[PDB]
Design a protein around this ligand. Structure first.
Ligand code: CLA
Ligand code: CLA
Ligand code: CLA
Ligand code: CLA
Ligand code: CLA
Ligand code: CLA
Ligand code: CLA
Ligand code: CLA
Ligand SMILES: CC(=O)O[C@H]1CC(C)(C)C(=C=C/C(C)=C/C=C/C(C)=C/C=C/C=C(C)/C=C/C=C(\C)C(=O)C[C@@]23O[C@]2(C)C[C@@H](O)CC3(C)C)[C@](C)(O)C1
Ligand SMILES: CC1=C(C#C/C(C)=C/C=C/C(C)=C/C=C/C=C(C)/C=C/C=C(C)/C=C/[C@@]23O[C@]2(C)C[C@@H](O)CC3(C)C)C(C)(C)C[C@H](O)C1
Lengths: 164, 164, 169
């Protein structure tokens, strides 16, 4: 499996701890599916952390609450009623397994020639977003359990313009 | 499909709306899988709506909440924090898709010359349990919105000795 | 330029400004590589050893006498000197076992094949050797820097970072 989309400089084939050693194409396909889905989720999650720092929807999630009062980070998993979170989870699942409001043919453009290049770019961005989402989670959760413990104030510490 | 498993004397082949005409055996397999899974879950429901009315486990589901105070039924949901609910949902999924913690071979017996009679018993029990859960949910929710509705203030009305 | 030594990496290439791996013998280059590997192994261990005891002093986790005056790991020479002496002695004994068993040319293969894990292919091995070497080089530099800095201004590593405004804790 040394020649399959994902081999890019600097590291030629990054399987240090021998995971692709004795596997059939089915297991590597499962691994690639997990990688691609994880990466997409991470990119969307990073964009989601950034954007509610300067824009919040105008509706009222949950009976009361309102979309403009909820905290932004690791919180907001404990400020939205559990029933709503479960319904969101199952809707994402419907889009995931059944693939429903998520297969519109206008979403598969004709990548004339550049198909492999764009697949490689998408995978690499997924990797970067997975690391970024880990960093954001660590900073927020640690500075929530003990306010401070990093010195760096603000949730998105890096883009100071958002004043947050 | 008028010979597949699932035909008993009261109402031999139940398909009034014609939902199983022209379908391929692959789908009818999926439909039967859904029926069995729903039936098992509904049995476990109609058994989990009754047990807490006289026996609460004792532990602490979340850092402050105790499974001695959270009301039973469609009310416990908004008590257990959403992160805990999620941490459950995903584990049940681990048992459901990747088949972990639920495939121990010494749980699958050899029904021998009964494997066509015990499966039917399981299916019919599931069919009854689904309707039982429907009724329990109706009573529980209708009274959780407007307390006193239907007059029977208790929960498991049909088992008065329990003192629901 | 090089003769097949697994080392040499993209950042630079074949780093040999002074011309040592041309004025040496076939056995001399082998000894040079062994020297490198061993120094690196020790260093890496020493860097981790500097980091963890010192941090345990910073966190008040070993009492209020662990590395008493300042917190420097170079202070064991004052508190518990005989412990350090006996530890160097035990290291010396196990390394005499090395010198006795291993033969010239090896001195790095501890025959720890089943007792541990290893990459299964061959290319990955070449990579793992290069890694071991690189981590060792960085650790050598780090150990020299730690010792020099601490001998300069008696102050632990994390505290030298906290003061002088280089961290945010
Ligand atoms: C009920 C809704 C639902 C359903 C039916 C599915 C169905 C599926 N997902 Mg999926 N997913 C969902 C919601 C759902 N997803 C949501 C909301 C997310 C977050 C964006 C994901 C993220 C996700 C990823 C990243 C992957 C899947 C994968 C899969 C496939 C099998 C693995 C699986 O689900 O077992 C679940 C088995 C587990 C062991 C669960 C792991 C639990 C993690 C490690 C920790 C949980 C943290 C905590 C509980 C949740 C906090 C986040 C939450 C508050 C948003 C299958 C098609 C995998 C796949 O395609 O193939 C491998 C895969 O890689 N999903
Ligand atoms: C849970 C997330 C996840 C998953 C399922 C995978 C899965 C995979 N990665 Mg991967 N990767 C991840 C996170 C993940 N990665 C992250 C965070 C990074 C950034 C450090 C990378 C960086 C990376 C590189 C650089 C390479 C892989 C490769 C691979 C494939 C073979 C290696 C393997 O897992 O065996 C496999 C499909 C290799 C590949 O493309 O195989 C063909 C490869 O060269 N990954
Ligand atoms: C169809 C349908 C129906 C009948 C409902 C009904 C409900 N939703 Mg809802 N929902 C739906 C589709 C539907 N949803 C869809 C398609 C989504 C997108 C995933 C959501 C996302 C959603 C959220 C995020 C929340 C609700 C909530 C609620 C409840 C509002 C509070 C209450 O008691 O009334 C209510 C039971 C709220 C809730 O559960 O509060 C208790 C809540 O926070 N819903
Ligand atoms: C929670 C709901 C949900 C989720 C997870 C997705 C997920 C996705 N949608 Mg999407 N979509 C949704 C609701 C959702 N959609 C709804 C309600 C509409 C109607 C407005 C669309 C209309 C839509 C289009 C038109 C396209 C997607 C596309 C996509 C994919 C990018 C991704 C799989 C793209 C594929 C694409 O082209 N979606
Ligand atoms: C999750 C809900 C669910 C699902 C997916 C099914 C699915 C199915 N049922 Mg079913 N059923 C259900 C709930 C459900 N049932 C309940 C609640 C009852 C009790 C009233 C029944 C009572 C029932 C009977 C009595 C029969 C079916 C039959 C069938 C099969 C063909 C009819 C059809 O749906 O098309 C199909 C596999 C038929 C069957 O098994 O034919 C082989 C059949 O005769 N069902
Ligand atoms: C991460 C958790 C997780 C995951 C990955 C799965 C994965 C799966 N489940 Mg599953 N399940 C779970 C948790 C999970 N389950 C839990 C906690 C329960 C309740 C005990 C169930 C009850 C359940 C049933 C009863 C059925 C499945 C089915 C399935 C399969 C397809 C599901 C589908 O199309 O999407 C989900 C698609 C939807 C449209 C969601 C519908 C949700 C209903 C309409 C209302 C939900 C309201 C909420 C509050 C798949 C193997 C089905 C199956 O195997 O055959 C088809 C099936 O019949 N599951
Ligand atoms: C909480 C998640 C969960 C779920 C949904 C199930 C679900 C199931 N288990 Mg199970 N199980 C679980 C946790 C779970 N188990 C744990 C934590 C253990 C370890 C004690 C077991 C040990 C276990 C055994 C030994 C057996 C099951 C069996 C079963 C099936 C009956 C059913 C699918 C049976 C199949 C069976 O024989 N389970
Ligand atoms: C005792 C320490 C030591 C030794 C013996 C070696 C030995 C070697 N290194 Mg090396 N290296 C070291 C430390 C050491 N390294 C450190 C700390 C770094 C990080 C800066 C590097 C970075 C490095 C690179 C980037 C490369 C080598 C390469 C080599 C090989 C060819 C160079 C040569 O002939 O030997 C060089 C060493 C000596 C002849 C003896 C030590 C040097 C003098 C005596 C020290 C002088 C005091 C010093 C300046 C104080 C600071 C050889 C096996 C090259 C290689 O892989 O070749 C294929 C190569 O490309 N090394
Ligand atoms: C036992 C058995 O049977 O099989 C074994 C076989 C074998 C091969 C032994 C095994 C292995 C592999 C092992 C043990 C690998 C270990 C690798 C290891 C331990 C590698 C350390 C690197 C540390 C570095 C580079 C330090 C950086 C530190 C740097 C660069 C610094 O800047 C330090 C710093 O101080 C400066 C200089 C200035 C200060 O102001 C600031 C700070 C403090 C930041 C296994 C897997 O265990 C199995
Ligand atoms: C246990 C518990 C909880 C729970 C729970 C859960 C998971 C409850 C689950 C409830 C569930 C799973 C309810 C399914 C019903 C499916 C039905 C009724 C199907 C009907 C289908 C019927 C009536 C008939 C269909 C057809 O006849 C038609 C119309 C024409 C024919 O041709 C074909 C057939 C015969 C098929 C809470 C709430 C999470 C918190 C609480 O604290 C603890």
């Amino acid at each position: 499996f040394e020649n399959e989309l994902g081999v890019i400089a600097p590291t030629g084939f990054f399987d240090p701890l021998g995971f692709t050693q004795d596997i059939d194409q089915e297991k590597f396909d499962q691994y690639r599916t997990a990688e691609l889905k994880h990466g997409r989720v991470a990119q969307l999650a990073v964009v989601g952390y950034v954007v509610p720092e300067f824009f919040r929807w105008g509706f009222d999630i949950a009976p009361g609450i309102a979309c403009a009062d909820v905290p932004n980070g690791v919180a907001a998993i404990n400020a939205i009623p559990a029933l709503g979170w479960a319904q969101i989870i199952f809707a994402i699942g419907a889009v995931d397994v059944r693939g429903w409001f998520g297969n519109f043919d206008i979403g598969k453009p004709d990548l004339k020639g550049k198909e492999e290049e764009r697949a490689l770019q998408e995978l690499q961005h997924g990797r970067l977003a997975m690391l970024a989402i880990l960093e954001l989670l660590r900073h927020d959760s640690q500075n929530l359990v003990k306010p401070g413990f990093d010195g760096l104030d603000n949730l998105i510490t890096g883009l100071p313009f958002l004043y947050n | 499909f008028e010979n597949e498993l699932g035909v008993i004397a009261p109402t031999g082949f139940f398909d009034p709306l014609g939902l199983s005409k022209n379908i391929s055996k692959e789908k009818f397999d999926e439909y039967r899988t859904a029926e069995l899974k729903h039936g098992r879950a509904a049995m476990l429901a109609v058994l989990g709506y009754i047990a807490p009315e006289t026996y609460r486990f004792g532990f602490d589901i979340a850092p402050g909440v105790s499974t001695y105070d959270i009301p039973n039924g469609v009310a416990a949901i908004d008590y257990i924090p959403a992160l805990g609910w999620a941490q459950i949902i995903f584990l049940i999924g681990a048992v459901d898709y990747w088949g972990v913690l639920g495939d121990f071979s010494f749980g699958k017996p050899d029904l021998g010359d009964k494997e066509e009679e015990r499966k039917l018993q399981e299916l019919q029990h599931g069919r009854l349990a689904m309707l039982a859960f429907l009724e329990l949910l109706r009573h529980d929710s209708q009274n959780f919105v407007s307390p006193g509705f239907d007059g029977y203030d208790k929960m498991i009305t049909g088992l008065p000795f329990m003192y629901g | 330029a090089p003769p097949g030594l697994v080392g040499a990496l993209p950042p630079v290439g074949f780093f040999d400004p002074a011309g040592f791996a041309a004025k040496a013998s076939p056995e001399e280059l082998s000894r040079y590589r062994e020297v490198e590997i061993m120094h690196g192994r020790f260093a890496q261990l020493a860097v981790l050893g500097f980091i963890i005891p010192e941090k345990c002093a910073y966190d008040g986790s070993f009492g209020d006498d662990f590395l008493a005056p300042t917190g420097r790991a170079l202070e064991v020479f004052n508190t518990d000197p005989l412990w350090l002496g006996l530890t160097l002695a035990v290291i010396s004994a196990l390394e005499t076992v090395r010198l006795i068993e291993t033969e010239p040319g090896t001195r790095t293969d501890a025959k720890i094949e089943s007792l541990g894990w290893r990459p299964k292919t061959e290319s990955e091995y070449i990579n793992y050797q290069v890694r071991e070497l690189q981590q060792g080089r960085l650790a050598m530099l780090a150990f020299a820097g730690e010792v020099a800095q601490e001998l300069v201004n008696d102050k632990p590593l994390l505290v030298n970072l906290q003061d002088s405004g280089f961290v945010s804790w």
